[PDB]
């Protein structure tokens with residue numbers, strides 16, 4: 058039932074290497090060709106990838122800014138409320154962004170904010186404007 | 192096995208079942224009740240045992256009955272029928288025994304046996320054993336045929352058969368008990384040595400041996416599981432099948448390499464897509480950083496849209512900086528997958544050149560044993576007789592294998608230098624016409640009831656015919672002769688001044704530069720404790736080599752050897768001989784093989800006797816006249832000395848049944 062382990066002998070394969078005096082030579086040059094293609098196509102992408110790596114050279118170290126390490130707070134200052142309305146205008150529902158921008162608020166506090174102030178900061182309206190843009 | 196059960200095995204019989212021959216001689220028993228079957232078997236195995244325990248003297252029916260113990264002792268007709276079957280058919284009182292019962296003074300029937308080989312000799316000696324009158328005609332000036340020993344001073348070397356292929360079940364065991372053969376076990380360690388003379392190293396020797404083995408298993412798979420036995424209109428050779436198998440290993444090596452290099456591109460394409468994302472992202476970062484720098488120019492305290500703007504850009508830039516750090520983690524991974532894959536390729540090629548040459552030697556070794564190019568062997572059937580192997584180790588005949596035919600010829604009417612030319616068989620009997628080999632117009636005529644033909648299959652195949660049959664052999668027989676193969680295999684005997692090689696080792700190989708010359712002096716044998724080396728020419732080499740001078744051949748021999756043991760260590764040889772079996776016109780090759788196109792069924796066809804039509808029209812069916820023996824007529828034991836011997840035994844039984852009658856087959 059079983060060929061020796063690691064010998065490969067498909068029905069389909071056999072009919073191919075036999076059905077002409079040189080069909081072996083066909084099949085084996087054709088794979089040899091395709092092998093060269095694929096080894097060239099590797100050469101292309103190596104050269105491309107190496108050029109792209111030259112463009113990244115330096116990383117992004119010159120551009121990173123230190124981060125706002127800041128404890129949350131029960132109290133909304135007027136500053137904080139005004140930041141928030143503006144973040145809403147820029148970021149729609151993305152609450153995590155909004156908490157980054159404000160920097161003394163958790164994502165929960167933010168979410169409650171949408172609810173408390175909904176009426177007074179016409180938050181509906183604000184969102185309608187962010188939607189109408191994106 | 193052993194006991195009585197061993198005697199069966201040692202006679203190539205199943206200790207616990209009745210054979211076809213037994214059935215046909217003992218229908219009453221085998222269609223009988225099973226208990227009588229056990230009795231039969233016992234008596235058989237027991238008589239076999241008595242003969243085997245002592246085959247230097249005739250085992251008579253009385254001696255047999257004497258030594259059976261009742262209830263088996265009781266039925267004396269059975270014991271008689273059984274003893275007679277065995278005797279007739281050559282299972283007991285074969286070979287060279289002291290006769291107890293004396294020979295019928297008056298003889299019955301006359302047989303002419305063509306050829307004094309082992310088959311011939313063995314039949315002769317049985318028929319005379321039985322009271323027929325027998326004469327052998329032999330073309331050569333000596334008896335043993337293709338058992339052909341070289342002898343000069345104390346040098347002794349077989350050019351013919353050389354090896355006893357193991358004693359377990361081999362009638363030659365009986366023969367060595369009877370003759371003095373000095374048998375000698377052969378050390379199976381075989382060292383190889385590439386074209387230059389460097390020992391192959393144990394690493395490669397084994398890689399390649401295993402691969403040889405896998406490649407054969409593979410043909411077998413190809414044959415049985417895939418039915419790959421006809422291709423176009425023709426039958427497939429073992430050689431073709433091996434090509435195909437190797438071509439597909441070459442293909443799968445490429446296929447592997449392809450899928451690996453495809454893993455590399457697909458990985459490179461991902462790295463590219465990612466390095467693109469990363470280059471765009473550094474751009475948006477750069478821009479945002481400037482923007483932040485700018486918005487930060489507005490100094491505090493400032494209105495809240497300005498504050499928003501600083502804080503918002505800051506956020507955005509750290510969000511993208513984070514995103515880029517993720518992407519450059521991924522990048523370091525993707526670059527690892529790639530140092531991994533570039534370091535772990537699949538194998539480069541299926542076989543190196545040193546590998547494919549070393550494998551060629553394994554193929555030469557096989558061409559050697561089948562005495563023919565692998566391209567001629569039947570894929571389905573080349574190995575059809577391998578089930579019939581004996582047991583124990585291959586041996587050689589220290590005093591020369593000739594000692595056997597020579598022994599067998601004692602007492603026997605042999606005409607040497609008598610080449611048969613025509614064989615005439617008719618309803619009334621036969622006439623054989625021969626000539627003197629020396630003076631080839633001196634002409635002889637032998638009249639007989641029956642001819643046994645043991646002419647070699649080579650000789651039967653010769654165009655135009657060395658021997659004419661009158662009437663001609665029927666198509667059924669001639670087509671079998673055409674389809675069977677008759678190969679070739681040669682030896683070079685190097686007789687030396689002093690032993691210069693590892694005597695711990697009987698044999699060693701030489702690897703051939705090309706595939707085309709894989710057979711050419713591919714192997715060397717040293718005769719046990721004696722200063723002689725033989726070198727073998729096999730496959731396609733054998734034929735070609737025949738047509739090249741002896742000094743050249745001994746040339747190439749000395750060279751190869753100098754390359755291994757160094758130019759200082761290798762003398763000129765005292766004597767040399769070179770076999771040429773295909774040119775030998777009494778042989779026309781070495782031995783038969785199952786050519787592609789044939790089966791073992793052809794060996795049986797080869798053994799069937801011929802029965803001439805009636806002389807007067809509408810007179811009844813004669814009896815058969817022309818019988819056949821020799822190596823090419825025994826399906827289970829072709830191309831050996833034991834099988835030649837068995838074929839003769841067989842025919843002698845067939846002829847005696849036919850001309851003396853077989854009393855023992857009657858209830």
Ligand SMILES: Cc1cc2nc3c(=O)[nH]c(=O)nc-3n(C[C@H](O)[C@H](O)[C@H](O)COP(=O)(O)OP(=O)(O)OC[C@H]3O[C@@H](n4cnc5c(N)ncnc54)[C@H](O)[C@@H]3O)c2cc1C
Nearest residue numbers: 306308309310330336337352354611781821822831832835
């Ligand atoms: C190189 C080689 C190595 C071998 N090695 C082994 C081995 O190691 N082990 C093994 O078991 N077997 C081996 N054999 C095979 C063995 O020699 C044969 O199978 C056996 O000897 C054949 O016996 P035979 O009686 O059928 O044929 P043969 O011995 O060939 O007998 C037939 C006789 O016919 C004679 N003859 C031919 N034409 C005519 C004619 N026109 N008129 C009268 N006589 C004629 C011949 O001269 C010959 O004497 C080997 C054979 C060869 C060639």
Ligand SMILES: COc1cc2nc(NCCCN(C)C)nc(NC3CCN(Cc4ccc5ccccc5c4)CC3)c2cc1OC
Nearest residue numbers: 354356404407556557559560561573574575576577829830
């Ligand atoms: C299916 O697996 C295998 C089967 C094999 N079967 C045979 N049969 C040989 C007798 C052929 N019969 C058709 C006459 N030989 C193998 N090959 C060998 C046998 C041992 N010989 C040593 C030898 C070599 C040559 C001999 C010549 C005459 C007498 C005895 C000889 C002994 C080398 C070839 C072999 C190998 C196989 O796989 C590794």
Ligand SMILES: COc1cc2nc(NCCCN(C)C)nc(NC3CCN(Cc4ccc5ccccc5c4)CC3)c2cc1OC
Nearest residue numbers: 356379411559560561562574577578579580581829830831
């Ligand atoms: C399918 O599986 C098989 C694999 C097999 N593989 C080998 N390799 C033999 C070399 C190893 N040997 C030294 C222990 N031989 C098989 N068989 C041997 C048995 C006896 N030898 C003896 C022999 C050897 C050489 C002969 C040359 C001419 C005529 C007859 C010959 C007979 C032949 C090969 C065999 C058999 C198999 O199944 C039946």
Ligand SMILES: COc1cc2nc(NCCCN(C)C)nc(NC3CCN(Cc4ccc5ccccc5c4)CC3)c2cc1OC
Nearest residue numbers: 200203204205360404574575576577578579580581582827
């Ligand atoms: C390394 O070398 C060898 C490898 C070997 N590998 C096998 N296995 C093949 C299973 C398939 N089948 C054809 C039996 N058998 C070997 N041989 C034996 C297996 C048991 N059979 C038993 C047997 C013995 C005598 C027989 C007589 C008539 C009909 C069948 C018979 C079967 C004989 C061959 C053998 C031998 C080798 O010897 C050198």
Ligand SMILES: [Cl-]
Nearest residue numbers: 331332333339
């Ligand atoms: Cl001769």
Ligand SMILES: [Cl-]
Nearest residue numbers: 339340341350
């Ligand atoms: Cl000789």
Ligand SMILES: [Cl-]
Nearest residue numbers: 430433434554
């Ligand atoms: Cl090959």
Ligand SMILES: [Cl-]
Nearest residue numbers: 491492493498
């Ligand atoms: Cl401020």
Ligand SMILES: [Cl-]
Nearest residue numbers: 665802803804
């Ligand atoms: Cl006829």
